[PDB]
Amino acid sequence: GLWSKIKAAGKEAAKAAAKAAGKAALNAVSEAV
């Protein structure tokens, strides 16, 4: 059938921004308190 081509990259793409994004978020408000 097919051995895929862009799977490890995409699976790693979204798996990073989402977390790294909310990261600076907590540090932001947690710094204003």
Curated annotation (Swiss-Prot):
Main location: secreted
Reported tissue expression: Expressed by the skin glands.
Protein's UniProt keywords contain Secreted: yes
Modified residues annotated as Valine amide in this record: V33
GO terms under cellular component: extracellular region
Origin superkingdom: Eukaryota
Keywords: Amidation, Amphibian defense peptide, Antibiotic, Antimicrobial, Secreted
Record's keyword annotation contains Hydrolase: no
Pfam families cross-referenced by the UniProt entry: DD_K (PF12121)
Localization annotation: Secreted
Gene Ontology biological process: defense response to bacterium
Family: Belongs to the frog skin active peptide (FSAP) family. Dermaseptin subfamily.
Function text: Has antibacterial activity against the Gram-positive bacteria S.aureus and E.faecalis, and the Gram-negative bacteria P.aeruginosa and E.coli. Has antiprotozoal activity against T.cruzi. Has antifungal activity against the yeasts C.tropicalis (MIC=10.1 uM), C.guilliermondii (MIC=20.3 uM), C.albicans (MIC=20.3 uM) and C.albicans ATCC 1023 (MIC=10.1 uM). Decreases viability of murine peritoneal cells. Fuses to, and disrupts liposomes.
Protein's name in the database: Dermaseptin-DI1
Native source species: Phyllomedusa distincta (Monkey frog)
